[PDB]
Design a protein around this ligand. Structure first.
Ligand SMILES: O=P(O)(O)O[C@H]1[C@H](OP(=O)(O)O)[C@@H](OP(=O)(O)O)[C@H](OP(=O)(O)O)[C@@H](OP(=O)(O)O)[C@H]1OP(=O)(O)O
Ligand SMILES: *O=P([O])([O])O[C][C]1O[C](N2[C]=NC3=C2N=[C]N=C3[N])[C]([O])[C]1[O]
Lengths: 1011, 83
């Protein structure tokens, strides 16, 4: 619908968005978890949300609620009504209402049938079951979600009714398969193109098109059985005509039905999503413990008290009795029960952040039918935060009357103060970065008076389309810096927070700012970036300075977190990400097969016509001054680079608006008519190769010329936008009345169209061609350039105004500049020329603009998970406590896993090193190179055979005469001035087997004196 | 003494609902499994991150070293670039 919804429209699709524009969600309980959910839903664009709560504000709530203020507490405002205006501001298209009416077991639940989904937090279990029974039995069922965080534990439950239709189960687009052969048999066997496995699984359904020969399969649906990576069987083809060539098969996506059971029944036979397959039995063990807590609250009307031995013994007894009533008779996990009784009255905000993201995506699934919902329980937990504590005393967990009581009751005061003392470096300040700053604020990061500081940096100003997933930015913040605005907002959440906001990007050209001393001062670096290059760069800096790094990322419903800890793990750069897709040169230029190929071609044509060529033109005449000088230098045998292309542009320069339309008309004829005729001249429709096969075999598609017709809206759109862009480049003023179809037809009415003339130009067919480098200039071309250069000088068409052009910059998010409209028209005209299915403007924009789909739900989820890992880094936890996470909420699937174990590289004699090792030798003034060699051997066990300083070869014994360098002092050998203190050297060693290459060791830092 | 050869079938699942069924030997290295996945998917080994039972599988080790058995499930995971 809107430019506010652009990035997330690509996640959900237009059909799902429209259902969200008609949905009313009821959310009860506005503690920390309800607030997170409400924030996500309003950002995602649910049309109406009612936030319900019956409780007054309390000082404790300031620790878990990022919209509450101390003024709310002194006035004892209702929790839902206090945050209502802050939530409403997240986007004024959403209707946010508050309710504070009582809500108990005598309440008539009929008012709930106004809602499509009900979300319940902080609600007693008996009432949950009563509401669940009501919801699931409505004539259309009201979808039901229950979610809670207690201390370091959480519970998420979905019940979308007896039969729920999922319209798209995976969120993945149907793949296309090219057919190579089909046999006449029962069953018939399909073979796909060589070197392209079909990647299909038995049972999937396919449709077919463009098969030549075997008439009867086109337009049919076939269920396949995989035979090999390249072949599968379909139906009976014995009676059909023989297969000749061609054919494309497309996966059909079938709607699926999911069955849900009541909360009451699911409590006794729970279906749990397994998020850590090292402990597949843990979710049922948590289910048991958390049901015991509900029974404790019902029996005693309170939660257990920390340190009260009788309370935890009772919770264990309830847990033990529940376990006997379950089907498997699962042993009770006494550790889970103990830590649940310990922390029950606390509340872990980053866990609520993560649960709130998942639960919000589940609400979206409930009202759209997009993606397969959770079925039916999720038990995200933060046990890895406390296991290292052992069994501490409870004094450290008791409330102290500050905003950190909720957190302290989870992790203890020692760890809280370590968080308050953190220096952390937050790189990037967009969607993830805004969620991180809010998570830091609730944790107290960097609030200590003594130590502690959040440094956040981002080079960007705030724009529209950022207010979707970045909840700290408002429309009145447009043109304000992201880092400054987010910093100011975080201070409102927590007034003790100390933040230093920069306007820089972290890259090689700012390494003098973010130098080694800067990283050494940080405790942890956290990335919130939108590209792989920045991630690998920051990683190289953290590795060089022995600092931990927490990375994360999203794409739509997909997300990851990665933990990098010195001496414990590998770093980010130990793995490679998928590169940008490389469309082969010949495919892009001559033989497109997909709409992606014509979109890239249109994007490249915009860049060539309106950016690259104008700037080459400008730089050429800036370098060579005037046309008379270039003419004199060409006739004297000199050759200037790009000269012939410049003169062509000079001679064809349009002088008025009319000539801009004529140029645009000429380009239409070249791109969408002549190109087709030229390829057919080189490769006639029926031309064959030496092997007797057709040249126009899949994936190649023959072009067909297009006849220009101003009555075609696609042709008019091309002519309009091409003409106005050429008018911009050539500085020709134009009014919007000159763009009318009537005004355009008159300008072209008496303009002759040049008939097509073929050439014997060679067109590359190799899929590994990669540009023809540079063709040498011909004798005819130089002769034609001189003719055009003289013709421009004689007719005074080479003045100063003629020697410059305006350079455009591709801007995807301004609809009035015509950039996207030009690309869409050019791409779809080229697609029609090749009988490729066109794409609408929104799809073309996504692909041309390299836009990455994003939704606040995933963003909030991975940010909560990163904050949990940051607590572990703060505490110096062991390797086993850390978790990477790889997730896709579309499925849903969550894979926690231990992070990458640090690897050992063997030097020799059992001596190994890791990426984190750095060796040091401390010399004195008379310390020689021989001293250095002996010092390395004595300290580290092996003698160096090579010493290098960058590219300077300090000592290479195999080079003639280097033995004399052993007696030289290290001062005279190195010659230092930039770093007075030390020099960083590269040291190598003799290999195990003689004659092989010397083995590199850790970097070695040599200190010239003892200081 | 040398053991009997133990052939097995394992499943490599993506996080997008796909399943790759692999015919392997228990003595296969993790390196060899990445090569087989490259043959089936076109994914270069240095882009493949494989998770089994909450641990990340590394080169230089065998399926048996990781206690991977008949009908075991591995997950093929990726890092995302948005933020
Ligand atoms: O610079 P490019 O973006 O790579 O486009 C060029 C350019 O076409 P346009 O400038 O009209 O957009 C050439 O025309 P000139 O400006 O050099 O006169 C044209 O050459 P011909 O007109 O002689 O065919 C050539 O096409 P080709 O290489 O098939 O000869 C075509 O290349 P692309 O459109 O494929 O990029
Ligand atoms: O994902 P979002 O677009 O919401 O935020 C990404 C954010 O990262 C910033 N960024 C990109 N590259 C950077 C960087 N910050 C600091 N250093 C480097 N190299 C970008 O400005 C976005 O706002």
């Amino acid at each position: 619908d809107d430019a506010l919804y652009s990035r997330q429209r690509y996640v959900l699709g237009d059909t799902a968005m429209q259902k969200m524009a008609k949905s009313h969600v009821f959310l009860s309980g506005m503690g920390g978890l309800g607030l997170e959910i409400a924030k996500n839903l309003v950002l995602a664009g649910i049309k109406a949300v009612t936030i319900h709560d019956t409780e007054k504000c309390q000082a404790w709530d300031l620790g878990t609620n990022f919209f509450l203020s101390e003024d709310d507490v002194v006035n004892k405002r209702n929790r839902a009504e206090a945050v209502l205006k802050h939530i409403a501001e997240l986007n004024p298209y959403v209707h946010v209402t508050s309710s504070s009416v009582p809500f108990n077991e005598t309440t008539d639940l009929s008012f709930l049938d106004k809602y499509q989904c009900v979300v319940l937090t902080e609600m007693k279990l008996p009432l949950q079951k009563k509401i669940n029974d009501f919801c699931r039995s409505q004539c259309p069922p009201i979808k039901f979600i229950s979610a809670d965080v207690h201390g370091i534990w959480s519970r998420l439950f979905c019940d979308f009714g007896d039969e729920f239709e999922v319209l798209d189960t995976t969120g993945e687009e149907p793949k296309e398969i090219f057919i190579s052969n089909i046999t006449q048999a029962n069953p018939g066997i399909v073979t796909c193109l060589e070197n392209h496995p079909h990647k299909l699984e038995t049972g999937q359904f396919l449709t077919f098109r463009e098969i030549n020969g075997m008439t009867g399969l086109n337009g049919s649906i076939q269920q396949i059985t995989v035979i090999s990576p390249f072949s599968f069987s379909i139906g009976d083809t014995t009676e059909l005509e023989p297969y000749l060539h061609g054919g494309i098969a497309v996966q059909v996506k079938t709607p699926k039905t999911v069955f849900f059971e009541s909360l009451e029944r699911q409590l006794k036979h729970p279906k749990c999503l397994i998020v850590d397959f090292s402990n597949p039995e843990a979710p049922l063990e948590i289910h048991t413990a958390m049901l015991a807590l509900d029974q404790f609250q019902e029996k005693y009307s309170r939660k257990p008290n920390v340190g009260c031995q009788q309370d935890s013994e009772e919770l264990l007894k309830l847990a033990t009795s529940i376990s006997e009533t379950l089907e498997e008779k699962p042993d009770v996990n006494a550790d889970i029960v103990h830590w649940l009784s310990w922390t029950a009255q606390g509340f872990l905000s980053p866990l609520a952040a993560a649960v709130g993201g998942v639960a919000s995506q589940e609400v979206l699934k409930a009202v759209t039918g997009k993606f397969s919902p959770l079925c039916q329980w999720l038990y995200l937990e933060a046990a890895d935060i406390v296991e290292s504590l052992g069994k501490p005393e409870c004094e450290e967990f008791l409330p102290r009357g500050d905003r950190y009581d909720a957190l302290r009751a989870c992790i203890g005061d020692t760890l809280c103060q370590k968080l308050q003392n953190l220096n952390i470096f937050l790189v990037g300040c967009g969607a993830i970065g805004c969620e991180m700053l809010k998570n830091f604020a609730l944790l107290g990061v960097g609030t200590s008076k003594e130590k502690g500081m959040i440094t956040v940096t981002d080079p960007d100003l705030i724009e529209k389309s950022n207010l979707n997933r970045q909840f700290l930015f408002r429309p009145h913040h447009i043109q304000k810096p992201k880092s400054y605005t987010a910093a100011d907002a975080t201070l409102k959440i927590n007034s003790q927070i100390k933040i230093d906001a920069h306007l820089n990007k972290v890259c090689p050209t700012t390494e003098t700012i973010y130098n080694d001393e800067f990283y050494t001062k940080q405790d942890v670096i956290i990335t919130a970036l939108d590209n792989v290059e920045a991630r690998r760069y920051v990683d190289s800096r953290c590795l060089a300075n022995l600092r931990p790094l927490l990375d994360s990322g999203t794409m739509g419903t997909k997300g990851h977190t990665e933990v990098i800890v010195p001496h414990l793990t590998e770093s980010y750069n130990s793995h490679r990400d998928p590169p940008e897709e490389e469309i082969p040169f010949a495919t892009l230029k001559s033989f497109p097969a997909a709409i992606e190929h014509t979109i890239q071609w249109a994007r490249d044509k915009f860049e060539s016509s309106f950016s690259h060529k104008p700037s080459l033109f400008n730089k050429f005449w800036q370098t060579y001054s005037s046309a008379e000088e270039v003419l004199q230098k060409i006739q004297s045998g000199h050759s200037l680079e790009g000269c012939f292309q410049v003169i062509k542009l000079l001679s064809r320069r349009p002088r008025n608006w009319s000539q801009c339309v004529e140029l645009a008309r000429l380009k239409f004829e070249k791109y969408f008519n002549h190109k087709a005729l030229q390829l057919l001249h080189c490769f006639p429709l029926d031309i064959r190769l030496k092997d007797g096969s057709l040249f126009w075999q899949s994936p190649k598609r023959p072009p067909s010329p297009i006849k220009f017709d101003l009555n075609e809206p696609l042709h008019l759109s091309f002519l309009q936008n091409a003409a106005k862009l050429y008018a911009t480049v050539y500085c020709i003023p134009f009014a919007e009345e000159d763009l009318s179809a009537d005004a355009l037809l008159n300008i072209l009415s008496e303009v002759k169209i040049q008939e097509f003339k073929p050439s014997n130009k060679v067109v590359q067919t190799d899929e590994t061609a990669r540009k023809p480098d540079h063709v040498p200039i011909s004798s005819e071309d130089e002769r034609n350039a001189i003719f055009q250069l003289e013709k421009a000088i004689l007719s005074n068409e080479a003045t100063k105004s003629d020697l410059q052009m305006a350079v455009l910059s591709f801007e995807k998010d301004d609809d009035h500049n015509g950039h996207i409209d030009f690309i869409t028209a050019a791409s779809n005209l080229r697609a029609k020329m090749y009988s490729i299915e066109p794409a609408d403007r929104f799809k073309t924009k996504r692909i041309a603009g390299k836009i990455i789909p994003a939704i606040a739900t995933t963003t909030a989820t991975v940010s909560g998970l990163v904050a949990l890992e940051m607590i572990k880094v703060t505490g110096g936890y062991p390797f086993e406590a850390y978790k990477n996470c790889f997730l896709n909420l579309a499925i849903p699937i969550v894979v926690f896993t231990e992070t990458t174990e640090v690897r050992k590289t063997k030097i020799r004699n059992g001596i190994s090193f890791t990426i984190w090792d750095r060796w040091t030798v401390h010399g004195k003034e008379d310390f020689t190179l021989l001293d250095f060699i002996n010092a390395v051997k004595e300290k580290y066990g092996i003698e160096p055979t090579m010493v290098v300083q960058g590219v300077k070869m300090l000592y290479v014994p195999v080079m003639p005469g280097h033995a004399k360098r052993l007696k030289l002092t290290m001062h005279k050998l190195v010659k230092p001035t930039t770093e007075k203190k030390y020099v960083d050297l590269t040291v190598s060693f003799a290999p195990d087997i003689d004659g092989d290459e010397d083995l590199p060791g850790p970097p070695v830092r040599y200190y010239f004196s003892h200081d | 003494m040398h053991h009997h050869h133990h052939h097995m079938q394992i499943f490599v699942r993506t996080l997008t609902g796909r399943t790759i069924t692999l015919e392997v030997e228990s003595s296969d290295t993790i390196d060899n499994v990445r090569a087989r996945i490259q043959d089936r998917e076109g994914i270069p080994p240095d882009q493949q991150r494989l998770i089994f039972a909450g641990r990340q599988l590394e080169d230089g080790r065998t399926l048996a070293d990781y206690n991977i058995q008949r009908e075991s499930t591995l997950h093929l995971v990726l890092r995302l670039r948005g933020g």
